[PDB]
Amino acid sequence: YEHVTVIPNTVGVPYKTLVNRPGYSPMVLEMELLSVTLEPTLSLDYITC
Amino acid sequence: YEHVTVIPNTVGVPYKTLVNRPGYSPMVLEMELLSVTLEPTLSLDYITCEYKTVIPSPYVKCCGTAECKDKSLPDYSCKVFTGVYPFMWGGAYCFCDTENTQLSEAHVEKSESCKTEFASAYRAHTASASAKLRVLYQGNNVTVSAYANGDHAVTVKDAKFIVGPMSSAWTPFDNKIVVYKGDVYNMDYPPFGAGRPGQFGDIQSRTPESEDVYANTQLVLQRPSAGTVHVPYSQAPSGFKYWLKERGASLQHTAPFGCQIATNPVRAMNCAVGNMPISIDIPDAAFTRVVDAPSLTDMSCEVPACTHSSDFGGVAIIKYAASKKGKCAVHSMTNAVTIREAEIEVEGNSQLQISFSTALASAEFRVQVCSTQVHCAAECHPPKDHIVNYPASHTTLGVQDISVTAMSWVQKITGGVGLVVAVAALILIVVLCVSFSR
Numbered sequence: 001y002e003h004v005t006v007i008p009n010t011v012g013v014p015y016k017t018l019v020n021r022p023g024y025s026p027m028v029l030e031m032e033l034l035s036v037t038l039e040p041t042l043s044l045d046y047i048t049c
Numbered sequence: 050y051e052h053v054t055v056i057p058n059t060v061g062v063p064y065k066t067l068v069n070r071p072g073y074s075p076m077v078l079e080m081e082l083l084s085v086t087l088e089p090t091l092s093l094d095y096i097t098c099e100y101k102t103v104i105p106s107p108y109v110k111c112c113g114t115a116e117c118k119d120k121s122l123p124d125y126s127c128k129v130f131t132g133v134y135p136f137m138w139g140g141a142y143c144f145c146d147t148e149n150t151q152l153s154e155a156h157v158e159k160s161e162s163c164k165t166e167f168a169s170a171y172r173a174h175t176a177s178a179s180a181k182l183r184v185l186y187q188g189n190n191v192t193v194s195a196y197a198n199g200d201h202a203v204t205v206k207d208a209k210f211i212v213g214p215m216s217s218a219w220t221p222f223d224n225k226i227v228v229y230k231g232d233v234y235n236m237d238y239p240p241f242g243a244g245r246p247g248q249f250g251d252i253q254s255r256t257p258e259s260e261d262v263y264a265n266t267q268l269v270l271q272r273p274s275a276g277t278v279h280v281p282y283s284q285a286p287s288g289f290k291y292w293l294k295e296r297g298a299s300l301q302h303t304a305p306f307g308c309q310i311a312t313n314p315v316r317a318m319n320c321a322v323g324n325m326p327i328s329i330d331i332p333d334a335a336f337t338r339v340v341d342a343p344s345l346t347d348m349s350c351e352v353p354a355c356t357h358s359s360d361f362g363g364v365a366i367i368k369y370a371a372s373k374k375g376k377c378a379v380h381s382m383t384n385a386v387t388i389r390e391a392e393i394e395v396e397g398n399s400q401l402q403i404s405f406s407t408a409l410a411s412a413e414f415r416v417q418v419c420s421t422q423v424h425c426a427a428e429c430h431p432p433k434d435h436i437v438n439y440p441a442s443h444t445t446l447g448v449q450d451i452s453v454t455a456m457s458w459v460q461k462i463t464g465g466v467g468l469v470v471a472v473a474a475l476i477l478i479v480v481l482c483v484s485f486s487r
Contacts, residue, residue: 022354022430023364 003029011035050336053328058215060084060319062440063183065391067380067417068331074342074419076335077378077391079185082325085197086180087220087317089173093256095241097170098163099287100252100264104280107273108152109135111143115152122156123262128270129153135278142278151273153280157252157264164257168289170238170250173226173315178215180325185391187335197325209330217323221304222315231312232299247285249292343375343395345421352427355405355412359441361389362432363405363412367423370398379403382422383414385451387443395419408446411454428454 007015014032054066063081070076108115117129130151135142143149178197183190186206195203197213204210223235227249236249242263244250252264271281301310309318348369356362363386371377377395381388389404395418403416413426 022356 005029007031007033009033009036050333051328051330053326056080056082056325056327058082058085058217058323058325059321059440062442065380065388070336072339073336074339075378075380075417077380078329079391080327081183083181083183083192084319085178085215085325087176087178087320088314089176089220089222089226091171091173091315094170094172094238095250095253095255096163096167096257096259097244097250097253097289098167098257099160099289100157100266101160102155102157102266102268102282102284104153104155104282107154107278107280109133109142109278110150110152112145112148113150115150117152118154123158123264124266124268125154125156126268126270127152127154130272133273134276135273136276137278153270153273155268155270155280155282157262157266157268159252159254159262163254167257168227168229168249168292170225170227172224173222174224176220176222178213180212182210182212182327184210184329188392199326202330207332207334211328211330213326215323215325219306219320219322221300221306221308221310221317221320226315228312228315229296232296232301233310233312233315234296234299244288246288247291248288251285251288339420342419343377344372345369345377345395345418346371348418348421348423350416350423350425352412352425355407355427355429356432357408357410357429358432359406359437359443360439361404361406361442363407363429364402365405365416365425366400366402367416367418367425368400369395369418371395377419379419380417381405381414382417384444385409385447386412386414388416389442406442408441408443409451 001019001021003017003019005017011033014030017029017031019027019029050070052066052068056064056066060082063079066078066080068076068078114131115129117127119125119127130153132147133149133151134146135151179195180197181192181194183192186208189206191206193203193205193210195201195210195212197215199211199214202209202211222233225235225237227234227236227238239245239248239250241253241255244253244263244265246265246267251266252262254262266284268282268284271283273279273281299310300308304310304317306320306322308320310316311318346369348367350365350367352363352365354364374396375394376392378392379388379390386405386407386409389406393401395401405412405414407429410429411426412429413424415422416425
């Protein structure tokens with residue numbers, strides 16, 4: 001059963017949402033971004049030393 | 050006790066009917082057409098198949114004219130060719146280079162395949178309905194099987210069933226029909242003894258075993274190639290062997306109302322057309338007295354969820370209290386909302402759960418629970434998925450006459466405009482009245 005949501009992009013804070021399936025008792029989903037990573041694409045221009 | 054009722058002719062969908070014998074407890078029967086079958090009455094007109102042309106060795110007359118005989122054979126042709134001079138492998142056949150003639154003759158016959166590879170052309174004028182039918186009687190799925198002609202009752206579980214006559218005479222077959230194997234085709238085949246060359250029926254016979262043949266292949270003998278002993282000829286190639294490449298689609302793939310077709314004997318199965326009368330003479334033992342059966346009171350209902358989902362996507366719960374332990378029948382008074390369950394256990398004070406299906410965007414209905422009625426209603430959501438592999442478990446919608454709660458928007462705007470045009474008519478009547486009152 002498919003459920004969609006959005007949470008603020010803020011690491012280590014838990015967020016809460018209500019699973020809703022009509023005719024079935026609800027349940028609660030908690031989720032937490034443990035980390036998020038951006039990895040840029042690098043082109044080497046030069047070394048110096 | 051004879052209860053008589055009418056169901057849609059759709060195979061594979063269950064229907065609920067309510068027996069309501071006065072002074073006894075009501076009883077619900079589920080029933081379901083497992084198949085229906087239209088079998089025509091067939092008269093064979095003729096067989097068609099592949100001819101063989103027969104050519105005896107050509108007689109060649111040395112030094113004279115050959116005599117052209119005549120005889121009746123199915124397409125007999127004979128000719129005398131003059132000024133021939135044939136060679137065999139060791140030399141010329143006749144004594145002289147001139148004044149010889151060759152008598153060429155030929156006819157046609159059925160190939161000895163015609164008792165196993167043939168098309169059979171029938172005239173198929175009237176048809177007998179037959180049906181096979183599940184009923185949920187006293188907690189047993191039990192099957193009955195009978196000719197749906199309106200006579201001929203059948204008995205099972207000591208209950209007597211009589212079925213038909215079927216409301217529509219419609220059938221996929223035209224008056225003329227042809228069968229090959231499992232295929233059958235509606236076509237206007239040519240008369241016996243009048244088939245054209247190179248088309249279906251260029252050769253014809255009354256039965257595959259018959260000795261008599263009509264054939265019309267336009268066979269024409271031709272002059273041998275000056276030195277060869279052969280018999281060349283021109284003929285239309287077999288109309289049957291052309292038909293086998295040009296048949297097109299059998300009735301099985303092309304008939305309306307979702308029919309399926311089969312052979313030996315030929316049938317149309319499961320035609321989704323019209324409706325079926327059914328009558329049951331139920332034996333007396335099934336009927337509990339209304340005073341002996343469990344009676345509910347103080348019942349009330351909730352619909353935790355509902356959807357238009359074709360397949361019992363609505364769910365409901367009824368609280369109740371009742372006068373004893375026992376078994377209790379359930380039915381829906383509103384044709385727009387079908388209920389899945391049929392009978393259920395009732396005891397003390399408790400609640401029962403049931404399933405329902407509908408097209409309605411806001412369901413409202415009365416559920417009868419043995420000799421008592423509860424009102425039930427709620428909102429319904431749309432299903433998500435556009436397409437399914439099964440027919441709907443409920444009727445089509447009353448599209449003009451039934452619509453959502455929030456139809457109150459119609460009552461608001463038509464009541465507001467209606468009030469204004471009535472206020473207008475009243476003020477006009479006041480000034481009209483004082484203009485007359487002078």
